[PDB]
Amino acid sequence: MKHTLPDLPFDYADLEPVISHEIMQLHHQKQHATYVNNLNQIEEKLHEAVSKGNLKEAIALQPALKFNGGGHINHSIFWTNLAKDGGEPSKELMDTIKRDFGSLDNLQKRLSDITIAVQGSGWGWLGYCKKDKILKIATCANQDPLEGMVPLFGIDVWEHAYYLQYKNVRPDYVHAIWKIANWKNISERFANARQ
Amino acid sequence: KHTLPDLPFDYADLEPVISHEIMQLHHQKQHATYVNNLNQIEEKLHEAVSKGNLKEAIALQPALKFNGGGHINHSIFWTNLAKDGGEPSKELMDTIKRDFGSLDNLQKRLSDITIAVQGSGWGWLGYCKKDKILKIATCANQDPLEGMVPLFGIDVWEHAYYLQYKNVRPDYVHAIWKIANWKNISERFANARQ
Amino acid sequence: MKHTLPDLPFDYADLEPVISHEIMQLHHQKQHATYVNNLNQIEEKLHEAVSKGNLKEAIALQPALKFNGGGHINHSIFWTNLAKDGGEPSKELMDTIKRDFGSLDNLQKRLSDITIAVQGSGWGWLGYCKKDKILKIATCANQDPLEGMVPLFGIDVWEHAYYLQYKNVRPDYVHAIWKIANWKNISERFANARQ
Amino acid sequence: KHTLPDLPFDYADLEPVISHEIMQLHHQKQHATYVNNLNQIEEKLHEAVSKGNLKEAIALQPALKFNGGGHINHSIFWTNLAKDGGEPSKELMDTIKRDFGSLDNLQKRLSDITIAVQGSGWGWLGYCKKDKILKIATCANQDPLEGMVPLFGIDVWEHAYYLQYKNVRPDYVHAIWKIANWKNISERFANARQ
Ligand SMILES: [Mn+2]
Ligand SMILES: [Mn+2]
Ligand SMILES: [Mn+2]
Ligand SMILES: [Mn+2]
Numbered sequence: 001m002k003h004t005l006p007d008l009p010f011d012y013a014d015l016e017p018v019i020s021h022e023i024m025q026l027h028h029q030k031q032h033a034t035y036v037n038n039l040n041q042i043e044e045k046l047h048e049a050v051s052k053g054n055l056k057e058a059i060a061l062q063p064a065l066k067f068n069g070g071g072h073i074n075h076s077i078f079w080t081n082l083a084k085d086g087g088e089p090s091k092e093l094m095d096t097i098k099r100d101f102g103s104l105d106n107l108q109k110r111l112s113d114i115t116i117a118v119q120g121s122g123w124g125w126l127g128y129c130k131k132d133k134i135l136k137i138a139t140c141a142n143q144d145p146l147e148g149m150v151p152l153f154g155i156d157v158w159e160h161a162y163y164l165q166y167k168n169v170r171p172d173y174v175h176a177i178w179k180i181a182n183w184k185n186i187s188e189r190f191a192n193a194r195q
Numbered sequence: 196k197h198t199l200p201d202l203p204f205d206y207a208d209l210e211p212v213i214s215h216e217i218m219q220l221h222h223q224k225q226h227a228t229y230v231n232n233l234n235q236i237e238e239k240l241h242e243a244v245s246k247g248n249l250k251e252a253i254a255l256q257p258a259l260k261f262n263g264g265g266h267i268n269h270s271i272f273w274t275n276l277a278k279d280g281g282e283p284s285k286e287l288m289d290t291i292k293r294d295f296g297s298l299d300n301l302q303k304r305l306s307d308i309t310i311a312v313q314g315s316g317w318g319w320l321g322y323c324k325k326d327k328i329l330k331i332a333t334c335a336n337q338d339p340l341e342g343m344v345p346l347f348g349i350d351v352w353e354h355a356y357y358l359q360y361k362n363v364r365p366d367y368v369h370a371i372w373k374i375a376n377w378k379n380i381s382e383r384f385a386n387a388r389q
Numbered sequence: 390m391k392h393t394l395p396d397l398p399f400d401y402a403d404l405e406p407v408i409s410h411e412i413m414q415l416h417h418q419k420q421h422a423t424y425v426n427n428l429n430q431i432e433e434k435l436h437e438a439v440s441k442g443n444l445k446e447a448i449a450l451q452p453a454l455k456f457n458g459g460g461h462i463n464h465s466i467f468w469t470n471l472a473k474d475g476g477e478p479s480k481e482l483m484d485t486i487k488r489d490f491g492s493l494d495n496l497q498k499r500l501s502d503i504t505i506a507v508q509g510s511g512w513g514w515l516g517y518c519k520k521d522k523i524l525k526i527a528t529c530a531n532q533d534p535l536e537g538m539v540p541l542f543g544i545d546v547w548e549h550a551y552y553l554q555y556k557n558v559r560p561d562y563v564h565a566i567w568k569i570a571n572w573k574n575i576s577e578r579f580a581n582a583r584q
Numbered sequence: 585k586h587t588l589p590d591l592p593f594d595y596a597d598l599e600p601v602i603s604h605e606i607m608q609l610h611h612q613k614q615h616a617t618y619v620n621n622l623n624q625i626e627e628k629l630h631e632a633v634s635k636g637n638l639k640e641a642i643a644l645q646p647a648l649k650f651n652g653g654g655h656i657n658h659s660i661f662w663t664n665l666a667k668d669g670g671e672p673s674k675e676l677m678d679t680i681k682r683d684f685g686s687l688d689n690l691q692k693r694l695s696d697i698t699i700a701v702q703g704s705g706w707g708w709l710g711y712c713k714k715d716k717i718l719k720i721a722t723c724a725n726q727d728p729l730e731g732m733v734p735l736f737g738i739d740v741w742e743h744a745y746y747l748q749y750k751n752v753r754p755d756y757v758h759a760i761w762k763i764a765n766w767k768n769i770s771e772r773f774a775n776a777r778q
Binding site for chain 2: 609613614617646650702703704705724725726741742743746747750751
């Protein structure tokens with residue numbers, strides 16, 4: 001059934017002064033809405049190509065499904081990842097961060113750095129690799145969804161996520177976003193990934 | 196489900212340009228595998244889509260492009276080759292002369308880019324309906340040709356020549372022009388113009 | 390010798406109301422400056438890797454050279470491509486646009502559309518293909534320089550090029566930029582490409 | 585300029601796992617070509633850089649990565665194979681057991697991803713000095729392994745197996761473990777830990 005724009009868990013100004021009201025409103029009401037609308041259109045066209053046996057057409061649609069489907073996935077997670085009252089990591093998550101990265105401080109630095117270094121548009125991720133039972137960090141280009149691991153915490157470093165407030169200074173945004181990291185949600189995602 | 200098409204000729208009909216063992220393996224093993232895998236991946240993809248698993252549906256894309264591309268590319272390629280391929284129709288020859296100067300220039304230019312492919316892939320002559328022109332391009336791996344109509348393809352995966360030509364890809368790419376099925380290429384051209 | 394940030398051919402507010410003063414100032418003084426500074430650093434590291442015979446290291450530096458070197462190339466061209474008094478295409482350029490695209494209106498639409506459709510960060514280009522003696526349009530991802538043809542006119546569709554003024558509405562920017570297309574410069578580039 | 589290294593063994597020493605014709609062509613023709621081209625491209629690149637032609641220097645990057653990668657990858661690969669490769673040192677075996685459970689799990693997991701390479705490429709076992717762990721990865725075409733130290737590589741370009749194994753890549757990838765030079769792999773491991 002059809003994809004829909006999820007309501008945010010908070011009002012558009014609830015993350016000030018870390019993320020502005022204007023940024024939240026445009027990012028949700030315009031950017032994410034566009035990914036959803038275009039996603040529904042692409043899924044229709046793909047369902048038609050598959051039904052008709054138009055293999056070339058079905059292949060040709062893949063980048064648009066990845067882009068808009070990834071936009072939907074990534075943003076949906078991102079809204080659940082942000083809070084004014086984020087709390088602290090669960091003990092078990094905190095313990096695993098210490099095991100895999102040494103400390104939360106190291107994790108935040110190492111993820112901030114790779115996220116900061118993204119060339120162009122993309123995302124930084126903290127994820128959980130089920131196979132090897134370890135936390136990992138990665139970046140993704142554009143809206144490519146995080147693959148090979150379960151997403152826990154995402155940082156959108158598309159210039160739309162920060163330019164209106166932080167201008168060119170991407171590092172100020174990436175460092176500041178940790179202050180609104182929704183650790184309750186991130187810990188819930190970690191618990192589910194270990195099931 | 197998708198099926199392996201029969202070749203329009205016997206496995207040895209392209210000797211001495213492409214060998215029997217190459218045609219047999221290429222068709223019965225390589226193309227077969229793309230077809231069989233295409234069917235498995237299409238099945239996995241339908242489950243993912245019918246269940247709402249967008250992430251898994253996106254994760255299956257590369258296998259669909261690869262095996263689906265494999266099926267598309269090879270199916271065109273077999274129709275592109277002939278023991279006696281004739282000559283290009285007058286309309287195609289005139290178009291080749293318009294857009295490349297001569298057949299010689301087209302062959303050289305398409306051979307050169309196809310030889311230069313880094314890794315596995317394909318060289319193509321195609322027709323851009325929009326700007327009403329012939330174009331040459333390459334594709335990586337089994338990516339299908341997009342943005343123009345395919346007319347003539349040259350498989351430069353190593354499995355396409357190695358048993359016979361060993362490392363000498365250029366010899367294979369220059370030699371395949373001897374068996375280019377110009378009857379088929381011309382028909383694809385005529386159909387691309389309608 | 391060392392790369393430097395070129396002075397703009399105009400003052401930071403000279404393209405209002407099509408491109409804001411704030412956008413011009415950040416884009417030149419901060420974004421392009423960063424590409425230049427990082428480019429010089431990367432060229433040094435590459436010259437060292439080559440001198441030492443450190444082939445793996447020289448290969449590893451390539452994405453950063455492409456990114457920052459491309460940033461320098463692309464922006465350098467882009468500033469010369471913009472003017473308040475852009476004039477009109479030379480007769481010969483106009484005649485070739487008509488030959489290859491039917492009309493200027495068609496060219497502007499077709500280039501605007503592909504530029505608008507860029508997934509992520511990138512550029513739209515009008516270029517000249519010397520081999521086939523034809524105008525072409527293309528997009529490039531991120532800062533990848535236009536290859537296979539001589540660049541004539543570039544449209545930066547990184548969100549930094551427009552978000553402060555146009556917000557999410559990229560099409561309004563892409564359509565509007567044609568009003569400040571420096572046709573004198575573009576025509577000069579066309580003449581040189583045909584030599 | 586770069587040179588083709590001699591093999592540490594005679595062309596037939598890996599029979600029956602890899603044939604004489606494969607080793608000869610692979611070394612004398614494939615690797616030679618990467619070396620020779622590497623030299624040509626390095627020359628073109630130096631002219632571009634010394635003249636300030638940034639655009640042309642960027643345009644030559646893919647040929648440097650490809651031929652330079654080719655030289656890097658093959659040079660490691662020849663040292664990675666042996667008629668009698670021994671067994672992993674105790675320190676490497678313990679590390680393999682820590683990070684993969686057993687040698688069996690490592691072999692299966694690396695074989696599976698290497699077999700799955702779409703097109704040409706390589707499978708690698710490497711060591712991540714930062715997080716102090718073994719990792720497995722694949723690389724496309726001749727891209728060199730980056731972000732970890734290379735320990736053991738498996739060439740899955742078709743030229744590496746086709747003359748002998750034909751289409752049956754899995755057989756070649758499972759069989760190469762028989763000739764993995766664990767003396768060399770262990771030395772690379774010891775050097776990766778210093
Ligand atoms: Mn976003
Ligand atoms: Mn093939
Ligand atoms: Mn820019
Ligand atoms: Mn090889």
